C-alpha cells in the first residue's frame, strides 16, 4: 500500500472508475520483469491473448494489435506503450483501439521485490482507470476489469514460478 500511493494513485473523473489488484509471485524480480517488459509478447503470461502483432522495435508510443481467444465479450484490442521504466520496473499502457467497451483504459503495472516464505519473491501491482460504458455501473466495470486482471496476474505467477525452483 506504500507502493500504491507512489505509483498507482489515479484521479478518475466522475464518468470513470479506477482500481487495482495485486499478486505475490514466488520468483525473483528480474525474471518477472523480463516477462512483463516484453511489450511485444503479452501472451507470454496473458492467458486470453491468441495472437499479438507489433511492428518495429519496442519504444514509447509503440502500438500492438492484440487478438483475444473466444469466451469473452470482445475479440481484439489496440494498445499503446506509454511507460517502460527498467530501473523502477514500471509498465504503463493505454487502450487506443479495439472492438471492446473499455474506452480510455489506462493501466499501470509495477513489480516490487518481496520476501515470500523466507525466499526471494515479487509483488506485482496493477492499477487502472477507465470510462464506465453506457448502461453499466462503476461497480460492474470494476468487477469485470478486476476479474480479467486477476486472471492475468495468476497466469503471470504460474509462468514465473515455473521458471524458478
Amino acid at each position: 500500500t506504500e507502493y500504491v500511493r507512489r505509483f498507482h494513485r489515479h484521479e478518475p473523473r466522475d464518468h470513470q472508475c479506477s482500481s487495482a489488484v495485486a499478486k505475490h509471485i514466488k520468483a525473483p524480480v528480474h525474471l518477472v520483469w523480463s516477462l512483463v517488459r516484453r511489450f511485444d509478447q503479452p501472451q507470454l503470461f496473458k492467458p486470453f491473448v491468441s495472437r499479438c502483432e507489433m511492428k518495429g522495435n519496442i519504444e514509447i508510443g509503440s502500438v500492438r494489435e492484440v487478438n483475444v481467444k473466444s469466451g469473452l465479450p470482445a475479440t481484439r484490442s489496440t494498445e499503446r506503450l506509454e511507460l517502460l521504466d527498467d530501473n523502477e520496473h514500471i509498465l504503463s499502457v493505454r487502450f487506443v483501439g479495439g472492438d471492446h467497451r473499455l474506452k480510455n483504459y489506462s493501466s499501470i503495472l509495477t513489480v516490487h521485490p518481496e520476501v515470500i516464505d523466507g525466499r526471494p519473491g515479487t509483488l506485482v501491482i496493477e492499477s487502472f482507470v477507465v470510462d464506465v460504458p453506457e448502461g453499466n455501473t462503476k461497480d460492474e466495470t470494476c468487477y469485470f476489469v478486476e476479474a480479467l486482471l486477476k486472471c492475468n496476474l495468476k497466469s503471470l505467477a504460474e509462468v514465473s514460478e515455473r521458471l524458478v525452483v
Binding site: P47, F48, K69, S70, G71, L72, P73, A74, R101, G135, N136, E140, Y143, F144, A147, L148, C151, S155
Partner: protein, 306 residues
C-alpha cells in the same frame, strides 16, 4: 447409419467446435426404459435385457478447442461404462423412478469428464495423467442425445441446443444456459458471483453461459451440471437436431424443423452417414452461413423414422 453431420470453421479463424456420433456406443439396461411389471406380461426379465443405443454430441468450444475435443473423445466412453454399472445396480433396486437415474448417470458423467479436464482426478491414457488437460480459461458446451428405439434422452450443458421435430411442429429438448436465466442468475449471485450485461449477459462480464465443461477460472459459478430430459419416441416423430450457437443465433427452431423435414422428404422422393440426414445437416450449415453466422457451425440431424 441413421444420421448426418455437417461442420464448418465458418467465418472464424480457428475451428473450436466438435461433435461425436457413436452408434451402438453402449447397451442401455431395459429397466431404465420399461417397468418390470410391463415386461413380465411378455415373459421377459427387464433386468437382463439390453437395448443398444447411439450417442450424438455437439461441443462448442471456447478459449481453445481442447475441451470440446476431449468431450468428444471421453463422454461416450464414460457414459457407456456408467450405463454398465447402472445396469448391474438396477437389478437390485426394485421398481423405482428411472428419471432420477438418468439424471444421476448423465450428471456424474459430465461431472467426471469435467474433473478430468480440470486435473481433479486421475485418468487413463493406456498410463495415468493428473495435470489439467488445458489452461483454465478453456471450456466447451456439451449437448448430448442418447437415442434408442424407445427413448431419446438429452443432457444439455451450455448454449448449444437440441430441437425435436415432431408432427410438423418444434419441441425444444434443451433450454440454453444463458446466465441471465432466472434460476441461473439466482444461483450465480447467491454464490457471490455477478452477472453483467457486457455485450450480452455474462458471468463476471466474461462468459455468456452459466454451465459448461472446463472454465475452472469461473468456478463454482460455471458448473458442468447438465439438464436431462427423457422423451419417449412416437411414430409421429420426424428427426432430431443438435447444433452449436452458430446455428441457433441466426436460425429459429421452427425454421430448422420445417427445413429438416423438407430436406429428408425431398431426398427420399429423389432417390458413414445417411444420405438424407447428411443432406439436411449440410443444408442447415449452409443456411446458417447464408444468414450471416460468424461462429463455428456444427449441426447433426438424426432421422427418427424407419
Amino acid at each position: 447409419p441413421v444420421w448426418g453431420c455437417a461442420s464448418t470453421r465458418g467465418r472464424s479463424a480457428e475451428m473450436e467446435d466438435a461433435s461425436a456420433a457413436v452408434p451402438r456406443f453402449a447397451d442401455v439396461p431395459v429397466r431404465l426404459l420399461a417397468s418390470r411389471r410391463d415386461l413380465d406380461a411378455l415373459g421377459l426379465d427387464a433386468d437382463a435385457l439390453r437395448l443398444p443405443a447411439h450417442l450424438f454430441g455437439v461441443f462448442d468450444g471456447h478459449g481453445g478447442a481442447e475441451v470440446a475435443n476431449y468431450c468428444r473423445e471421453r463422454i461416450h466412453v464414460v457414459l457407456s461404462a456408467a450405463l454398465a454399472r447402472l445396469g448391474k445396480n438396477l437389478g437390485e433396486m426394485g421398481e423405482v423412478d428411472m428419471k432420477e437415474h438418468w439424471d444421476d448417470v448423465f450428471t456424474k458423467c459430465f461431472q467426471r469428464v469435467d474433473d478430468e479436464v480440470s486435473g481433479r482426478v486421475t485418468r487413463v491414457v493406456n498410463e495415468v495423467r493428473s495435470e489439467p488437460v488445458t489452461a483454465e480459461n478453456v471450456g466447451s458446451t456439451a449437448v448430448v442425445a442418447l437415442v434408442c428405439s424407445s427413448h431419446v434422452v438429452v443432457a444439455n450443458c451450455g448454449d448449444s441446443r437440441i430441437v425435436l421435430c415432431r408432427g410438423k411442429e418444434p419441441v425444444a429438448l434443451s433450454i440454453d444456459h444463458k446466465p441471465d436465466r432466472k434460476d441461473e442468475r439466482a444461483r450465480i449471485e447467491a454464490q457471490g458471483g455477478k452477472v453483467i450485461q457486457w455485450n450480452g449477459y455474462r458471468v463476471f462480464g466474461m462468459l455468456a453461459m452459466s454451465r459448461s465443461i472446463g472454465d475452472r477460472y469461473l468456478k463454482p459459478f460455471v458448473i458442468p451440471k447438465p439438464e436431462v430430459m427423457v422423451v419417449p419416441r412416437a411414430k409421429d416423430d420426424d428427426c432430431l437436431i443438435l447444433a452449436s450457437d452458430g446455428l441457433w443465433d441466426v436460425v429459429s427452431n421452427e425454421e430448422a424443423c420445417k427445413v429438416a423435414r423438407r430436406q429428408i422428404l425431398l431426398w427420399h422422393k429423389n432417390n458413414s452417414t445417411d444420405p438424407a440426414a447428411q443432406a439436411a445437416a449440410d443444408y442447415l450449415m449452409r443456411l446458417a452461413l447464408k444468414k450471416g453466422s460468424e461462429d463455428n457451425i456444427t449441426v447433426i440431424v438424426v432421422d427418427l423414422k424407419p
